[PDB]
Amino acid sequence: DPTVFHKRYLKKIRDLGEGHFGKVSLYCYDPTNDGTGEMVAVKALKSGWKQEIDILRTLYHEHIIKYKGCCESLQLVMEYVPLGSLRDYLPRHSIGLAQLLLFAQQICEGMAYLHSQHYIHRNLAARNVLLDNDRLVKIGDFGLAKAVPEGHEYYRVREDGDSPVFWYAPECLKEYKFYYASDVWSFGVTLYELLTHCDSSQSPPTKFLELIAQGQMTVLRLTELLERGERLPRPDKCPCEVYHLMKNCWETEASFRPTFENLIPILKTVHEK
Numbered sequence: 001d002p003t004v005f006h007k008r009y010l011k012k013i014r015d016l017g018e019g020h021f022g023k024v025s026l027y028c029y030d031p032t033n034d035g036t037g038e039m040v041a042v043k044a045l046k047s048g049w050k051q052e053i054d055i056l057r058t059l060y061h062e063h064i065i066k067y068k069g070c071c072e073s074l075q076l077v078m079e080y081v082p083l084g085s086l087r088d089y090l091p092r093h094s095i096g097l098a099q100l101l102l103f104a105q106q107i108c109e110g111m112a113y114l115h116s117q118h119y120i121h122r123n124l125a126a127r128n129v130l131l132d133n134d135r136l137v138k139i140g141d142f143g144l145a146k147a148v149p150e151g152h153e154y155y156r157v158r159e160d161g162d163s164p165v166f167w168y169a170p171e172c173l174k175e176y177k178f179y180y181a182s183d184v185w186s187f188g189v190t191l192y193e194l195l196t197h198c199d200s201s202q203s204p205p206t207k208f209l210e211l212i213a214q215g216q217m218t219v220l221r222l223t224e225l226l227e228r229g230e231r232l233p234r235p236d237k238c239p240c241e242v243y244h245l246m247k248n249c250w251e252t253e254a255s256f257r258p259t260f261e262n263l264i265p266i267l268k269t270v271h272e273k
């Protein structure tokens with residue numbers, strides 16, 4: 001069973017940084033001891049602590065990080081994605097609008113697929129979207145993901161620790177309800193990060209905090225100002241039509257937002273123009 005990784009064939013190279021609920025590292029996997037082996041990414045895990053594994057095991061698509069197996073405190077083993085996160089990539093290269101849109105498209109494809117499998121992500125930001133060699137998008141960090149039971153539209157969870165509240169729709173900040181439409185909001189914020197080249201001083205927490213204290217006063221204030229209709233600003237050099245898309249992803253009421261399935265055509269259309 002090539003889903004079962006043996007400690008004895010796993011040799012560490014680099015730390016790769018941190019995901020939600022565990023460190024990630026690059027390992028060589030050399031079961032036949034051939035001196036070359038295979039590069040893999042391993043996340044060290046550990047109620048619902050194994051949910052990341054259970055969810056990702058069941059996902060297969062070109063725009064989601066590929067599950068490889070586990071090592072029996074548990075280790076999750078995934079494809080290594082060499083270029084890393086969009087958040088560290090974009091500030092360090094010049095990238096064309098047409099290509100930022102293409103990255104946007106691919107996030108939507110994967111998110112549409114994820115939604116079709118009845119999962120929500122709840123952690124969609126540029127820091128968690130990774131790039132492979134051909135600059136293909138792979139969505140990552142499934143630490144916060146949940147299954148939405150059949151014929152329900154949301155899931156209720158109060159996170160005990162940190163979560164990307166600056167990426168979260170009002171219904172999530174206020175009532176701890178997470179809809180499919182909530183990931184669409186997050187994707188709107190993510191679309192903003194791409195267009196601001198993930199400049200740190202343009203970043204959502206940067207911009208939101210400008211308009212604003214304590215950890216949870218911040219959240220109540222942020223909720224208040226989203227409900228009043230205030231939003232991140234148009235990125236410099238961002239086309240009008242694209243700003244419209246983001247604005248649509250940030251409708252206050254979740255039923256107004258477009259779906260990822262809706263977004264694919266629209267992004268394809270704007271990708272040429």
Ligand SMILES: CN(C)C(=O)c1ccc(Nc2cc(N3CC[C@@](C#N)(C4CC4)C3=O)ccn2)nc1
Pocket residue numbers: 015016017018019020024041043078079080081082083084085088127128129130140141142
């Ligand atoms: C400074 N940088 C960016 C790096 O040194 C670097 C370069 C490549 C690379 N590839 C890679 C990274 C992950 N990671 C990073 C941690 C995470 C989790 N969970 C992030 C989603 C949150 C995850 O899946 C997974 C598979 N391949 N990673 C890092």
